[PDB]
Design a protein around this ligand. Structure first.
Ligand SMILES: [Zn+2]
Length: 289
């Protein structure tokens, strides 16, 4: 309520088992979602919604790496996708209003800003209703119950599991950054998600790896995510405004002006792959300690 909740720092023991790490990682993800509930329902704060959306993304990536040892039931995965879409739609409209539209310097953009704010507030109300619905509360309860049941069934230490995942994710990131080509949406998106997956996994198994080696690895990853995410916000804005033009034909002139400005920003300032390649060419897989 009122205050935004950021993901709690998870410091796992070096000698900790997989049966101890799995409920600690997923529990941290569920807490990150739960502690933002009230503020997303009652308020309109963008950071509280941002933190809840990130929490859902962190949970989905955690279930993806744990999929081999503990596969999540398909019914829960459908509800996680529903929750991600509901909070995601509200987040997309908030990014457009606070970050994508203000960087646009023809005079009819004031009424467009009022229309976008109206949609963003309505999407926040729609997200609030999704959280108050029994579908959400049942999902959080069923996920927690499944987490605790599957936890003692896992074999080996956390260090043995993390090294296999970290080797695959570093291999996946470097491969996608090399296969990456200019003006290709599919390759740029694959690199951005490999950057997110790698950042989350290293934050989950934080107390298992070297303090100064991971800090430099996370810095190079966060910089790559910031660059590819900047170009991604521009293409999402163009998609959201084109959808708004079809539903609201009255503000179409103001929409097309904003769409024209953003389409040019995509061509004039594309995702600087050369700076990304130079930022990731030196990176070595973080070693256990
Ligand atoms: Zn309201």
């Amino acid at each position: 309520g009122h205050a935004p909740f950021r993901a709690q720092a998870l410091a796992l023991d070096a000698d900790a088992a997989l049966s101890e790490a799995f409920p600690a990682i997923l529990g941290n993800c569920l807490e990150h979602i739960q502690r933002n509930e009230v503020a997303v329902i009652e308020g309109h704060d963008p950071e509280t919604l941002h933190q809840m959306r990130v929490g859902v993304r962190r949970l989905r990536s955690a279930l993806k790496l744990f999929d081999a040892v503990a596969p999540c039931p398909p019914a829960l995965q459908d509800d996680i996708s529903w929750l991600g879409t509901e909070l995601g739609a509200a987040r997309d409209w908030d990014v457009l209003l606070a970050s994508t539209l203000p960087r646009i310097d023809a005079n009819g953009l004031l009424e467009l800003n009022a229309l976008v704010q109206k949609i963003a507030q309505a999407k926040r109300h729609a997200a609030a209703q999704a959280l108050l619905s029994p579908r959400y509360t049942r999902l959080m309860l069923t996920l927690g119950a499944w987490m605790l049941e599957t936890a003692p069934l896992l074999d080996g230490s956390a260090a043995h599991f993390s090294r296999q995942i970290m080797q695959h994710l570093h291999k996946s990131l470097l491969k996608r950054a090399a296969r990456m080509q200019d003006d290709d949406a599919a390759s740029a998106h694959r690199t951005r998600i490999a950057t997110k997956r790698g950042r989350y996994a290293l934050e989950f198994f934080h107390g298992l790896y070297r303090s100064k080696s991971t800090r430099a690895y996370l810095k190079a990853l966060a910089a790559t995510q910031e660059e590819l995410g900047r170009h991604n916000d521009l293409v999402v804005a163009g998609r959201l405004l084109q959808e708004l033009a079809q539903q609201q034909p009255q503000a179409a002139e103001a929409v097309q002006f904003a769409r024209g400005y953003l389409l040019a920003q995509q061509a004039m300032r594309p995702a600087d792959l050369d700076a990304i390649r130079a930022g990731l060419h030196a990176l070595r897989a973080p070693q256990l300690r």
